[PDB]
Amino acid sequence: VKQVFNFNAGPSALPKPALERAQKELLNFNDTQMSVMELSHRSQSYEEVHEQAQNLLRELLQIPNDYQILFLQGGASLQFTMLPMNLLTKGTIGNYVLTGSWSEKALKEAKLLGETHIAASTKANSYQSIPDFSEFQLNENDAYLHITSNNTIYGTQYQNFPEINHAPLIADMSSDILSRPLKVNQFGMIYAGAQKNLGPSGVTVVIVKKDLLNTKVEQVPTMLQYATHIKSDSLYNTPPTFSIYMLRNVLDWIKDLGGAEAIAKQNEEKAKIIYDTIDESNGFYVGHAEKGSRSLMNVTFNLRNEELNQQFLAKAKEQGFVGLNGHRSVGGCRASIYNAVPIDACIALRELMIQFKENA
Amino acid sequence: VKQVFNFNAGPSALPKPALERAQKELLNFNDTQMSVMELSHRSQSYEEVHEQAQNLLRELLQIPNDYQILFLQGGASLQFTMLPMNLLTKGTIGNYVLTGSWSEKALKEAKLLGETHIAASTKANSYQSIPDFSEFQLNENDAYLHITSNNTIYGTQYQNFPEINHAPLIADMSSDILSRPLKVNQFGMIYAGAQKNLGPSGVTVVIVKKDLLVEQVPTMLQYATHIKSDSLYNTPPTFSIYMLRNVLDWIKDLGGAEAIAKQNEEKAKIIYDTIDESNGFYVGHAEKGSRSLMNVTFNLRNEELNQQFLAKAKEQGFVGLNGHRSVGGCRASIYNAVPIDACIALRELMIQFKENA
Numbered sequence: 001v002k003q004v005f006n007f008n009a010g011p012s013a014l015p016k017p018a019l020e021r022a023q024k025e026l027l028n029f030n031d032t033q034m035s036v037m038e039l040s041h042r043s044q045s046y047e048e049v050h051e052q053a054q055n056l057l058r059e060l061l062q063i064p065n066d067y068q069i070l071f072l073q074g075g076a077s078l079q080f081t082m083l084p085m086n087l088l089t090k091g092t093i094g095n096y097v098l099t100g101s102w103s104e105k106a107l108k109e110a111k112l113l114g115e116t117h118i119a120a121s122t123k124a125n126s127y128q129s130i131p132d133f134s135e136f137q138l139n140e141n142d143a144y145l146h147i148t149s150n151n152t153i154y155g156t157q158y159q160n161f162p163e164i165n166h167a168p169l170i171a172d173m174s175s176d177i178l179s180r181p182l183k184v185n186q187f188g189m190i191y192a193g194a195q196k197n198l199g200p201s202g203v204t205v206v207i208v209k210k211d212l213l214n215t216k217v218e219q220v221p222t223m224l225q226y227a228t229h230i231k232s233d234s235l236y237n238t239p240p241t242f243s244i245y246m247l248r249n250v251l252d253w254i255k256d257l258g259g260a261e262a263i264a265k266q267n268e269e270k271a272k273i274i275y276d277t278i279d280e281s282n283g284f285y286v287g288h289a290e291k292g293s294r295s296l297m298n299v300t301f302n303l304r305n306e307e308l309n310q311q312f313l314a315k316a317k318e319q320g321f322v323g324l325n326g327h328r329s330v331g332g333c334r335a336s337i338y339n340a341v342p343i344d345a346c347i348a349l350r351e352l353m354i355q356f357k358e359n360a
Numbered sequence: 361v362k363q364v365f366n367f368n369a370g371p372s373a374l375p376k377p378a379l380e381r382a383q384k385e386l387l388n389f390n391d392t393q394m395s396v397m398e399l400s401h402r403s404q405s406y407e408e409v410h411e412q413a414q415n416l417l418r419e420l421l422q423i424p425n426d427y428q429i430l431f432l433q434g435g436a437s438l439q440f441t442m443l444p445m446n447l448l449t450k451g452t453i454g455n456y457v458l459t460g461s462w463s464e465k466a467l468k469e470a471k472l473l474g475e476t477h478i479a480a481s482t483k484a485n486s487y488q489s490i491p492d493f494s495e496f497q498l499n500e501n502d503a504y505l506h507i508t509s510n511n512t513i514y515g516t517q518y519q520n521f522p523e524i525n526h527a528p529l530i531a532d533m534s535s536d537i538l539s540r541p542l543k544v545n546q547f548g549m550i551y552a553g554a555q556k557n558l559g560p561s562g563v564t565v566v567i568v569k570k571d572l573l574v575e576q577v578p579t580m581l582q583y584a585t586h587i588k589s590d591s592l593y594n595t596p597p598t599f600s601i602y603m604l605r606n607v608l609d610w611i612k613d614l615g616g617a618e619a620i621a622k623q624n625e626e627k628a629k630i631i632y633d634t635i636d637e638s639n640g641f642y643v644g645h646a647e648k649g650s651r652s653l654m655n656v657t658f659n660l661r662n663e664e665l666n667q668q669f670l671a672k673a674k675e676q677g678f679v680g681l682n683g684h685r686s687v688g689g690c691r692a693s694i695y696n697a698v699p700i701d702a703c704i705a706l707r708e709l710m711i712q713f714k715e716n717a
């Protein structure tokens with residue numbers, strides 16, 4: 001077989017055992033002689049999958065008992081509007097920390113619904129770093145403080161999270177959820193599209209402190225209330241059953257390999273392969289991120305000019321690498337190295353990078 | 361070994377060829393050595409599938425060029441709010457025809473957002489029929505007229521559709537889309553969750569007259585966002601759209617919408633003839649002139665017998681026959697991919713149960 005190295009940024013590589021499991025039972029799930037895709041969401045077989053996906057997330061992230069796990073449709077992008085629709089009430093402020101383009105998109109949706117503020121930002125310097133928490137400008141009437149833990153386009157990531165007492169801390173963790181241990185009780189809400197570290201596209205995981213969001217909000221459509229989904233255990237309407245089943249299968253693989261602590265060790269090792277290659281290149285490759293903010297999930301870099309960027313990306317494509325072109329808004333290169341990307345893909349990328357440099 | 365007959369009401373049976381195809385290439389789609397689930401949605405590999413799904417829908421339903429085909433998340437239930445959010449503007453009315461519970465759920469969401477009206481309703485007679493179109497109460501300032509083509513819980517279905525000129529006709533076709541030919545030009549918008557006739561759950565198809573379709577609406581909740589971006593504004597439900605493509609290829613291979621309608625008419629006939637020849641042992645909920653070809657609703661003469669029948673069916677491998685909780689009785693869902701042999705098996709079980717009663 002031709003060699004293929006999957007560095008896609010979203011959707012992305014899945015752990016092969018989760019896919020092989022799904023393949024084997026695609027036509028006959030749990031001895032029912034039906035696919036999981038053909039079952040009722042009120043069947044015992046599906047209810048067991050739904051519940052197991054929650055229980056695995058709870059165990060793996062050590063989610064406290066006063067938080068609920070929601071499985072919603074619409075992507076992280078729908079959460080950009082659902083969050084302020086539920087929490088940005090008259091007289092309060094949706095306060096945002098801007099660390100990339102995804103932060104900006106979240107802010108934009110809140111501005112349509114109420115007052116907003118920028119607590120801190122590295123926009124002026126093209127999002128090369130996470131701002132120091134001492135810079136954060138907080139308001140007594142903040143409805144929440146929103147952060148983006150991993151800035152997928154820019155290749156930067158929070159190393160730790162601020163202690164916020166005056167309003168709930170909310171995080172878009174789409175591109176680094178369950179890549180490392182997390183202290184969930186620092187947050188009022190965490191959300192993530194599944195299609196980077198958890199599963200395929202079509203479900204969004206929302207971890208919510210129940211008493212923050214379990215109350216009706218007057219005038220919000222039924223489907224757009226967190227309370228609807230909390231009360232119905234994410235079964236208010238028909239869920240994305242195959243996406244939640246695949247999420248379950250991915251979480252079983254994370255657990256089998258040793259959980260969040262083990263996957264962080266793996267992720268640190270594979271990121272270091274690529275960062276060391278950059279750092280050893282005497283400026284032939286230049287990372288976008290400041291070293292103290294380097295993402296473990298998305299490695300962003302450029303060559304010395306756009307002609308070399310093009311030549312490198314063309315060679316990479318010829319050699320079987322998929323997905324390395326930077327996001328269209330910024331150019332350059334982006335190696336996405338989510339949980340399931342194998343370490344031999346990273347070794348292969350290092351070898352490509354060394355050879356291209358030496359032959360230039 | 362075990363015989364299983366899948367009469368689930370949603371999600372539901374899929375075509376064996378579509379599932380077998382998906383299984384075979386689950387790890388290696390189109391020689392990429394990746395699953396379709398592992399592709400970027402901005403890849404040519406995914407974009408080809410996305411476009412093919414749209415193209416097959418256009419071909420099979422004969423959707424004119426002045427309509428757009430959207431693939432959205434959130435189910436039909438999110439459309440209950442997204443439609444009025446976009447079209448129910450100040451001074452206009454969201455006018456509803458009530459033919460079942462799903463019609464009521466749609467009306468409920470419009471009421472939160474603006475003025476609503478009931479053009480006609482068969483609620484008072486327990487939704488046994490579709491109202492005569494001459495009874496429709498229409499308003500000059502209607503933003504739209506909303507119908508539910510197939511009333512999934514009640515087992516009734518529009519035989520044809522009204523000619524509406526004063527405002528766009530909008531239909532929740534979740535439980536009968538692409539079960540028969542349609543004249544799409546009758547409508548301003550059609551929507552359907554995929555999980556009955558088109559594919560697995562997680563994608564919703566919206567067919568919209570492009571000139572139909574907003575200040576202050578969130579980006580994700582504007583139809584315009586998805587029209588302009590070809591349903592690629594954010595990450596789509598890629599596997600669900602791939603499966604939709606596979607289902608549409610199966611429909612096309614069987615001869616299209618007329619061929620599927622003939623199959624569906626034959627399946628429904630088996631069940632209704634069994635009811636009608638039963639000397640009152642089985643009774644349909646629907647008036648004969650409004651009977652659905654998609655969901656056949658019926659009861660036995662008392663609740664103990666209903667429970668006995670449903671227990672026997674479950675024992676013999678039938679899945680999904682319990683009626684919706686809100687009405688009780690029995691419901692045989694016979695969407696496109698439910699095979700005729702399952703309908704024959706249900707008949708034979710119904711005849712034996714009556715004989716042994």
Ligand SMILES: *Cc1c(COP(=O)(O)O)cnc(C)c1O
Nearest residue numbers: 075076077102152174193594595
């Ligand atoms: C990809 C991405 C999103 C958008 O997710 P969708 O599921 O496409 O709406 C939001 N936030 C981050 C950090 C992302 O990487």
Ligand SMILES: *Cc1c(COP(=O)(O)O)cnc(C)c1O
Nearest residue numbers: 237238435436437462512534553
């Ligand atoms: C099942 C159904 C719905 C609800 O669909 P979801 O995808 O669960 O939101 C709406 N309308 C009809 C006619 C249905 O049958």
Ligand SMILES: [Cl-]
Nearest residue numbers: 100101151153
């Ligand atoms: Cl970003």
Ligand SMILES: [Cl-]
Nearest residue numbers: 009152153327
């Ligand atoms: Cl991105």
Ligand SMILES: [Cl-]
Nearest residue numbers: 460461511513
């Ligand atoms: Cl109904």
Ligand SMILES: [Cl-]
Nearest residue numbers: 369512513684
């Ligand atoms: Cl239903």
Ligand SMILES: [Mg+2]
Nearest residue numbers: 252253255256
């Ligand atoms: Mg295990």
Ligand SMILES: [Mg+2]
Nearest residue numbers: 342343344345
């Ligand atoms: Mg290997």
Ligand SMILES: [Mg+2]
Nearest residue numbers: 487488514645
């Ligand atoms: Mg009826």
Ligand SMILES: [Mg+2]
Nearest residue numbers: 633634636637
């Ligand atoms: Mg006859």
